[PDB]
Design a protein around this nucleic acid. Structure first.
Lengths: 98, 78, 60, 127, 24, 155, 120
RNA sequence: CCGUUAGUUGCCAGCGGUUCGGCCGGGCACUCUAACGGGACUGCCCGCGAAAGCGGGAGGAAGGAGGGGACGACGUCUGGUCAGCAUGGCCCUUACGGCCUGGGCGACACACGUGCUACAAUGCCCACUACAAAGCGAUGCCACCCGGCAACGGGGAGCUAAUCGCAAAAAGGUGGGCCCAGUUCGGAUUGGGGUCUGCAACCCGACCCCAUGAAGCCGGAAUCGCUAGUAAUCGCGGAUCAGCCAUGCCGCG
């Protein structure tokens, strides 16, 4: 039972990047428990638009950490093939656990 | 307001304790108005800076526990 | 002064109380968002360029 | 044996489960009148029944979670209604007239900058 | 109410806890 | 209201007598959106109408209101010079608005310490037709008559 | 009935009534009523001479009060004048003492509003 | 609003074991979480119209811009900002640069703006009583123990946090108290004892507990906001940040 966390600012290249990680584990391992979407940690910034004294009117900036999760029940190396380096994630991260 | 020391300045004490072997000087001028007036080292007169000058403050028993700044007021006509 | 100052804010000083922030570009004291070492202006600036990643136009 | 409709109203969601026969109503492992204890309006949540005639003749087991009480009262009011249309496509033409069937979109409008409060604006002094 | 340190309400408003509103 | 006529906002029937007029009156009792506390009051007050008279509350209620509706009132008006209190017929929707508003105001003018009582005794004093609400209502009606001389300006 | 100093609380509950003493608040009176075992709800109107002395005794003794308290305050302040600390000349001047603003407010410590002229 | 994909957050929904806490096997139904789609078009009916469209009716979560944002034409105000930054000119270059310690920006006879807390019984106090809705936390949140009336101090488990913590939601509901009083309203001011952060709290920090309890009984002439989940009212979080003068602001419900 290999279980993996994936963070990302980019909601597209996760459901993308870490869901090829479901082909290369059903095609090369056995049973998968599909992609699970963890709720998001949304850091927000509120910024006064002008250099000087314009306290009403500012603009809203968010920085949104998306969180996806993957479970597979197959600690063999018929899997750990693609699933070590066979890349398409460029602004992503990995948590590796069992 | 603390209870683990009386956060009084080294540079001042050093100068009082070392005056405490026959020492009766007025010429004593500090800048640490932040330092607590400490149990019994009284008799003397300390010139406390108010930001513009030091002030001849005589120090008595009834007035321990208080800081030095309390006796050297910093602003004018009040 | 703002130089002898941009400089002084870099020396780890006697007592950490004296440790302040400073917009790392727009070399500046106030409204320094800690997650970016960035002054609210020199900040709205880079954000607009996309030179701070994931950072975006919020709207709800 | 079992019947379901989901009600929502403003952060609050209702799990409604209708069962045939009776009259009693659980909400969150608690009697109705124990959950909505002397809150004048609660008697409203079951008004969908009163309108069909199943005034009593149904049991109800209920989960209810989300923000706050008076919403939940309405949340249920939808569940109950939705649940019993899925025990009768013929339960349309009487429930829709009083429309216990419309979700009701009205949420907290959002706090805006420069205002104090979404619409309430700061205090002008002119002179 | 909200102005009185020594009320429940006082404490809430003020953020604090103490004798007049404990932490259970 | 520059564009439209605005729909008479439609109210949710009384969950206890089944009357829109009642909710209306409950809302006028309400302060800072404490609708719960408000209805307690109206009902506790219907309690105090049995406990004191033989007849049905909904009936005292309907009636008290009826007596407090003004039929004419003065509306102010621009003319070449200063202003004119111009008497004119008071529209049904407003009659209602004013009645309820006045009942609640008059109620909280009374001396008794607990709200449901004040509401009740005022409701009672009204159907008998002698509350301070029916007072500040004959004041209007009378004042529209005082000014009967200017009733040739009504728009 | 005269408990402390020169004090006759009356006809209201004793917790409330004890209050009417200078140096007794809602707290010190909650206390006395337990350390002497008097139901605090009891009306002064109705309570044992027994109780009234158990009270007299506890209160007049446990803590400084109502007049000779007042005297200690008067004399704590005239001593804050000492050689003359800050808070001293400040009491001297009749201005705030727990370091608050004076530009606006400070009305409690200053006699209503001595208005002047100026401007153009 | 509905669907598809997806099962450490959802449950007897269904059944079994439950030390009766979804806790345990077990399942994703449902709730949710988050990605993707569908859905509304004056498309349908009646009436008016030359047409656009208007008024009404159907069905539908939603109907005629369904609700809230982001988004600000050509230009105007020789508007704002040289103290964010960039910059032409101009000016000081043992000083108009620099360093430090202390004071100041916190002064107070006055005057205005914006707010807070009130003036109370539709109220105040004390008790008991999950209705959760955004966000933050490994030089942190700190459960839970013990000492202390408490601030807080010991200890001390868990969480790189849908898992652990901040966290009590408050208004509410139930019970009891106060009985119209400058009060069990209101908490200013002052005396005192302490806690914490910090080299350091006099000028100039917040917090706890004892005392003290001020003006205020709803405000002249004026004058501000808001058209619906709005106003009013009740709490909750965050940014800066050692601590904090936040009642401010940006956000949640």
């Amino acid at each position: 039972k290999i279980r993996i966390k994936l963070r990302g600012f980019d909601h597209k290249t996760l459901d993308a990047s870490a869901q090829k990680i479901v082909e290369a584990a059903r095609r090369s391992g056995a049973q998968v428990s599909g992609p699970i979407p963890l709720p998001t940690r949304v850091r927000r910034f509120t910024v006064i638009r002008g250099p000087f004294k314009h306290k009403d009117s500012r603009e809203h900036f968010e920085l949104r950490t998306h969180n996806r999760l993957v479970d597979i029940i197959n600690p063999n190396r018929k899997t750990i093939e693609q699933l070590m380096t066979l890349d398409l994630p460029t602004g992503v991260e990995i948590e590796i656990k069992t | 307001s603390l209870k683990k020391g009386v956060f009084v300045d080294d540079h001042l004490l050093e100068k009082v304790l070392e005056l405490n072997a026959k020492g009766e000087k007025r010429l004593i001028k500090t800048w640490s108005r932040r330092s607590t007036i400490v149990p019994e080292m009284v008799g003397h007169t300390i010139a406390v800076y108010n930001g513009k000058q030091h002030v001849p403050v005589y120090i008595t028993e009834n007035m321990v526990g208080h800081k030095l700044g309390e006796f050297a007021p910093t602003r004018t006509y009040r | 002064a703002r130089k002898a100052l941009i400089e002084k804010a870099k020396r780890t000083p006697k007592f950490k109380v004296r440790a302040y922030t400073r917009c790392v570009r727009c070399g500046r004291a106030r409204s320094v968002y800690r997650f970016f070492g960035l002054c609210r202006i020199c900040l709205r600036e880079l954000a607009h360029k996309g030179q701070l990643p994931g950072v975006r136009k919020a709207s709800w | 044996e079992q019947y379901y409709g989901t009600g929502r109203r403003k952060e609050a969601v209702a799990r409604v489960f209708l069962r045939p026969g009776n009259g009693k109503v659980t909400v969150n492992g608690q009697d109705f009148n124990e959950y909505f204890q002397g809150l004048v309006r609660a008697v409203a949540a079951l008004e969908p029944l009163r309108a069909v005639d199943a005034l009593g003749r149904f049991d109800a087991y209920i989960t209810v979670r989300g923000g706050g009480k008076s919403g939940q009262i309405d949340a249920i009011k939808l569940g109950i209604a939705r649940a019993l249309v899925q025990y009768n496509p013929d339960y349309r033409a009487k429930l829709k007239p009083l429309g216990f069937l419309t979700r009701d979109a009205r949420v907290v409008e959002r706090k805006k900058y420069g205002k104090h409060k979404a619409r309430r604006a700061p205090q002008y002094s002119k002179r | 109410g909200k102005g009185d340190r020594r009320t429940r309400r006082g404490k809430i408003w003020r953020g604090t806890y103490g004798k007049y509103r404990p932490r259970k | 209201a520059r564009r439209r006529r605005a729909e008479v906002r439609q109210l949710q029937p009384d969950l206890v007598y089944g009357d829109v007029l009642v909710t209306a009156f409950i809302n006028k009792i309400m302060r800072d959106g404490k609708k719960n506390l408000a209805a307690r009051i109206f009902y506790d007050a219907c309690k105090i109408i049995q406990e004191k008279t033989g007849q049905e509350p909904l009936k005292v209620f309907k009636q008290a209101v009826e007596n407090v509706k003004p039929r004419m009132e003065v509306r102010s008006r621009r003319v070449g010079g200063a202003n004119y209190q111009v008497p004119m017929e008071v529209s049904p929707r407003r009659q209602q608005s004013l009645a309820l508003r006045w009942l609640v105001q008059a109620a909280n003018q009374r001396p008794e310490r607990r709200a449901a009582v004040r509401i009740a005794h005022e409701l009672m004093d009204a159907a008998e037709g002698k509350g301070g609400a029916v007072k500040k209502k004959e004041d209007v009606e009378r004042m529209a008559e005082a000014n009967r001389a200017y009733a040739h300006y009504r728009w | 009935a005269r408990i402390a100093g020169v004090e006759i609380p009356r006809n209201k509950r004793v917790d409330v009534a004890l209050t009417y003493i200078y140096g007794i608040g809602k707290a010190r009176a909650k206390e006395a009523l337990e350390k002497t075992g008097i139901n605090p709800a009891t009306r002064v109107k109705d309570l044992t001479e027994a109780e009234v002395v158990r009270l007299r005794e506890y209160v007049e003794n446990t803590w400084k009060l109502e007049g000779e308290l007042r005297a200690e305050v008067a004399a704590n302040i005239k001593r804050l004048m000492d050689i003359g600390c800050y808070r001293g000349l400040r009491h001297r001047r009749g201005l705030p003492v727990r370091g608050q603003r004076t530009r606006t407010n400070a009305r409690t410590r200053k006699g209503p509003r001595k208005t002047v002229a100026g401007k153009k």
